[PDB]
Structures are given as structure tokens and as C-alpha cells.
From a paper:
Cytoplasmic incompatibility (CI) results when Wolbachia bacteria-infected male insects mate with uninfected females, leading to embryonic lethality. Protein-binding experiments and expression of cif genes in yeast have shown that CifA binds its cognate CifB specifically and rescues CifB-induced yeast growth defects.
We determined the crystal structure of CidAwMel to 2.75 Å resolution. These residues are part of the N-terminal domain.
Author numbering: 5 to 83, 87 to 110, 155 to 157, 166 to 276, 280 to 422
Write the structure that this text describes.
């Protein structure tokens, strides 16, 4: 495990891109990659790890924050330094049927069967190949089916990369929303799974089409109060877990929270009752992220403003309950014990300070 962990860090410290977010996205992609192929690389040494460097420092392999599997597979089949990885193991894993490594699943399969089987196997490189071999008519239907199947409660992290791929290849996200709404909380599970794996871009696209595109939405709210509140709580946890992607997580928090379609939900989230308020984790999450000192963070002022405006919004909706709101938040920040929180510092004081500024 220590060895496995070392492997992960070394492979991530080579990625460098001008945009911090793109890089961080890639460090995550590498993590996911290493998760899939850990056994192959388990026993390894630095010298053998340089082959993984020339293919990972090559921007050809990278398509945005994600990896171009086709290119990557080709690079994983060339025996400069030796491929310590087996060509056959990799070729099969990357569905390179032709140019089979030669000297498991991989026979010959029709497209639909392969698609339906690869998804069951949670084989991200498998679903992609078959998607290509699919008839154009059948494409959207097959993808939609996969999404519905994989947007399920008892899910796993592997499902998210496939879900990401399916959403990005859906050419009509309006019908997708509709086929998802038939499933119980099928829309929540799709967004929550993409959030946990930090596929923020995909979520933004979905939020823009499903919440911001039109005056119309048969329930006007695609999400419920619970799903709305859970989205924000889950986003605040990921933001504290991935401080380099906090800008993208903060923008998603604001877009969901301040959406006009969910304005009633926004007012309910700041209603303090029974010594609790649903925005506690989220408002506490932004405060902790704003006071982080282990990262060089530009625009801490913008972050402070969001916090202040969220506090001001709570005062404007229920002015009578504001002192209750202040006491609940201060007490929550003193016992929270969440990630990114510096131990031994009283975060309650920071809140008290924000409350005073508001008074003036």
C-alpha cells in the first residue's frame, strides 16, 4: 500500500499544464488510471516508470482533463524505453482488436452485445469501442440505457467515468432528463456520482441545460428539497477534499443555490428551526475553504463576498431568526472537524467577525 501510494504520487507530479484546473483534473485521471491498472504496475521501479512518463508528459494522449484512450493504447503497445507492461494485457484492455498483441473477453461481438456487456463489466475502454461500432440510430438509446442503469443507489466509483462518457456523447440532453425522471431519484444519482469523481464540467453542462436554458421544466423542479440540499452538501465536501478545484466547485454551488427555479428551496435552506439550518455544512464549508492556508489561493476576497452575501441572504429572508442563525453557525464551526480545517484554531471567531462586518 505504501508502495502503491508512492506510485500514485510520482505519476501525478509529472503533469504540468498552464491552467491549474486542467492539471488537477489530470492528476485525478491518473489516479483513476492507476486504480484500474495497479496490479500491472504494482511491482515497479523508477527506471521502469520513465516509460509511463514519456506517454503521460505527451499532450497527445491527453484530451482535456481526460485521456485519449485510443492514443494511449497505441502508446502502451510499443515495445523509447521498454514497455514493462504486457502488450497483450494492454491491447486487450484497450480493445485494440486489430494489431492484437499476440506474441478473456478478447472473439468477435456484435455492437449491442458488447456495449451491454462492457457496461456490466465497468470497462470504460470497452464501452467506448463498442459505442463506435454501434449503429447511429441505436447510439442514443444505448447510452441512455447505460445512464439509467448506472445512476443507481448502490453504485461504485468506477461507474462515474462511464457515466461521464455517456453524457458527453448525448446529443439531446432534453430527452435524457425525461427518461431519467421516470427512475426514482435517477437525476440525483447521476449528478451526485459525477460530483464525487470531480467531473465538474459535465455537471455544469447538465445544470445549464436542465436548470438555466428555459422558462420551462411534470414537475417544475427537477430536484427535490432533499436532492437540492444534498447536492450542495456533497459539493462542499468535495471542495474541501480537492482544494485546487474549489473554484469549479464554488461556481457549481452558486449556480445550484442561486438558480431562480429553486428560489423557494433557497429560502428554505436558510430557515433556522430546531437549532439547525440546512445551509450549515455549505456555509461552513465556504468559510473553511476561505481560511485555508496550505494553498496559494488568488481571489480570497471573492470568496469572502460570497460568504457575506449568503449570510446577508439568510438575514433578509428570516430577520427574526438571525441571531439564532448566528449561534447555530458559530457552534457548528467549533465542532465540525472537517477536511481543510486547521486544528486548534477557532473557526467560530471568523464567523463572528463576518457577522459584525455585516452589521456595519
Amino acid at each position: 500500500t505504501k508502495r502503491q501510494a508512492e506510485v500514485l504520487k510520482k505519476l501525478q507530479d509529472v503533469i504540468k499544464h498552464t491552467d491549474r484546473d486542467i492539471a488537477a483534473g489530470r492528476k485525478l485521471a491518473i489516479k483513476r488510471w492507476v486504480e484500474t491498472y495497479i496490479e500491472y504496475i504494482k511491482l515497479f521501479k523508477d527506471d521502469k516508470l520513465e516509460f509511463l512518463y514519456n506517454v503521460f508528459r505527451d499532450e497527445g494522449c491527453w484530451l482535456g482533463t481526460r485521456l485519449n484512450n485510443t492514443v494511449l493504447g497505441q502508446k502502451l503497445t510499443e515495445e523509447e524505453i521498454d514497455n514493462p507492461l504486457p502488450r497483450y494485457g494492454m491491447a486487450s484492455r484497450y480493445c485494440i482488436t486489430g494489431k492484437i498483441g499476440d506474441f478473456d473477453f478478447w472473439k468477435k461481438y456484435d455492437a449491442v452485445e458488447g456495449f451491454d456487456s462492457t457496461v456490466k463489466l465497468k470497462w470504460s475502454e470497452g464501452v467506448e469501442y463498442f459505442y463506435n461500432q454501434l449503429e447511429e440510430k441505436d447510439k442514443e438509446k444505448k447510452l441512455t440505457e447505460a445512464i439509467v442503469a448506472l445512476s443507481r443507489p448502490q453504485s461504485v466509483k468506477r461507474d462515474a467515468p462511464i457515466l461521464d462518457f455517456c453524457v458527453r456523447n448525448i446529443g439531446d440532453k432534453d430527452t435524457l432528463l425525461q427518461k431519467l425522471l421516470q427512475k426514482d431519484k435517477g437525476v440525483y444519482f447521476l449528478l451526485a456520482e459525477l460530483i464525487e469523481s470531480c467531473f465538474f464540467d459535465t455537471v455544469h453542462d447538465l445544470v445549464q441545460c436542465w436548470c438555466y436554458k428555459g422558462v420551462s421544466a411534470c414537475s417544475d423542479k427537477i430536484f427535490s428539497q432533499q436532492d437540492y440540499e444534498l447536492f450542495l452538501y456533497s459539493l462542499s465536501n468535495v471542495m474541501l477534499k480537492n482544494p485546487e478545484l474549489s473554484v469549479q466547485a464554488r461556481s457549481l454551488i452558486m449556480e445550484i443555490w442561486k438558480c431562480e427555479r429553486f428560489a423557494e428551496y433557497r429560502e428554505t435552506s436558510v430557515n433556522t428551526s430546531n437549532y439547525t439550518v440546512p445551509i450549515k455544512s455549505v456555509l461552513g464549508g465556504l468559510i473553511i475553504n476561505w481560511k485555508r492556508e496550505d494553498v496559494c489561493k488568488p481571489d480570497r476576497e471573492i470568496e469572502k463576498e460570497e460568504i457575506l452575501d449568503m449570510i446577508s441572504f439568510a438575514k433578509g429572508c428570516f430577520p427574526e431568526k438571525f441571531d439564532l442563525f448566528k449561534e447555530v453557525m458559530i457552534e457548528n464551526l467549533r465542532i465540525c472537524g472537517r477536511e481543510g480545517k486547521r486544528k486548534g484554531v477557532d473557526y467560530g471567531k471568523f464567523a463572528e467577525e463576518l457577522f459584525l462586518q455585516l452589521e456595519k
